[PDB]
Amino acid sequence: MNIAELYGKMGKHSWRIMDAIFKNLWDYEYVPLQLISSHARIGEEKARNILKYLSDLRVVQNRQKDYEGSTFTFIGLSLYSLHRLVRSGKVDAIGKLMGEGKESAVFNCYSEKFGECVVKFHKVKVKEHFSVLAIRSARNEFRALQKLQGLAVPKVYAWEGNAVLMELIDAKELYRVRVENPDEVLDMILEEVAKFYHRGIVHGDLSQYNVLVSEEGIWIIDFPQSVEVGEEGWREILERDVRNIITYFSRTYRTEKDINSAIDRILQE
Numbered sequence: 001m002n003i004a005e006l007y008g009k010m011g012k013h014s015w016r017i018m019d020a021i022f023k024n025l026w027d028y029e030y031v032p033l034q035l036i037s038s039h040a041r042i043g044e045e046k047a048r049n050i051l052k053y054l055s056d057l058r059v060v061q062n063r064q065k066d067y068e069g070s071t072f073t074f075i076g077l078s079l080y081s082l083h084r085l086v087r088s089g090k091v092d093a094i095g096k097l098m099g100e101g102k103e104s105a106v107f108n109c110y111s112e113k114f115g116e117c118v119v120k121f122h123k124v125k126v127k128e129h130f131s132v133l134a135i136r137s138a139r140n141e142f143r144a145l146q147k148l149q150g151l152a153v154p155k156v157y158a159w160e161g162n163a164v165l166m167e168l169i170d171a172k173e174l175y176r177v178r179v180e181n182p183d184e185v186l187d188m189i190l191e192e193v194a195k196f197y198h199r200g201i202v203h204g205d206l207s208q209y210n211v212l213v214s215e216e217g218i219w220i221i222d223f224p225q226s227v228e229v230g231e232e233g234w235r236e237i238l239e240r241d242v243r244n245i246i247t248y249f250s251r252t253y254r255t256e257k258d259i260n261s262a263i264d265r266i267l268q269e
C-alpha cells in the first residue's frame with residue numbers, strides 16, 4: 001500500500017496519537033498507553049482503539065509483554081516525519097519511490113518552494129531502539145549537508161524525524177556509469193573530499209554507490225555516517241573513504257593512484 005494512500009487514511013486523532021509517541025521516544029522505546037493517552041488528551045479506551053488500527057496499518061507496533069506500550073515501525077515513523085514536512089509547508093505531495101534498501105527509502109516529491117526534490121527516510125557504547133537511531137541518522141545527514149552547502153552535494157531543505165528533504169540531482173551512481181576519463185574523475189572526487197575535510201567533515205561511507213556522475217560533473221550524497229574532524233576515529237574514517245574510492249577505480253579502470261600519498265595530500269592541505 002503506498003505511503004500516499006496510508007497518509008490519506010490518517011485523521012487528526014491519528015496524528016495526535018503519533019505525536020504523543022514521537023515526543024516520548026526520548027525516554028521509552030515502547031511509550032506506555034497511559035502517556036500516549038495523557039499527552040494526546042484522548043481517553044484510554046479510544047487511544048487503545050486508534051493504536052490497534054494503526055497497527056493493522058503497520059504504522060505502529062504494540063507490545064503487551066511487560067506493559068501496554070507502542071512505538072513506530074519504519075513506515076510509521078516515515079509517515080509521521082512526512083506529516084511534519086507537509087505541515088511545515090515544505091512538501092505538498094509525496095511522489096513515487098525511487099529506491100529502497102538496507103539504510104533508507106528515497107522518494108520523489110514536489111515542493112512549491114523548492115521544486116522537485118527527494119525525501120530520504122532513514123532506517124537503522126556496547127556492541128551486541130529503532131526510532132531514536134533513525135532520527136539521529138537523519139539529523140546527522142542534514143547537518144553535514146548544511147555544512148557542505150556550496151560544494152558538489154545536494155542543496156538541503158529540511159529535516160523532520162527520520163526524513164531529510166533535499167535537491168534532486170539528475171545524475172547516476174558512479175557504479176552504473178563507465179567513464180572514459182577515470183583519472184580525472186577520481187581526482188575530482190578526491191578534491192571534493194579535501195574540501196569536505198577543510199570544512200571539518202568526513203563523509204564516512206564514500207563509495208561508487210554515493211558518488212553521482214554526469215557529463216556536468218560529480219555530486220556526493222549520503223552523509224548519515226559522516227563525522228566531524230576531531231571526533232573519535234575521524235582520521236581513520238577519512239583514510240577508509242580515500243582508500244575505498246581509490247580501490248574502486250583500480251579495480252574498474254586500473255587507475256594507478258597511490259593510496260598513502262593521496263591521503264597525505266588531503267590531510268596536509
Ligand SMILES: Nc1ncnc2c1ncn2[C@@H]1O[C@H](COP(=O)(O)OP(=O)(O)OP(=O)(O)O)[C@@H](O)[C@H]1O
Pocket residue numbers: 098099101102103104105106118120154166167168169170171173209210221222223
Ligand atoms: N538527492 C538525490 N538525488 C538523486 N538521487 C538520489 C538523491 N538521494 C538519493 N538518491 C538515489 O537514491 C539512492 C540511495 O540513496 P543514498 O545512497 O543516499 O542512501 P543509502 O541508504 O546510503 O544507499 P547507498 O548504499 O546506495 O549509498 C542513491 O544511491 C541514488 O541513486
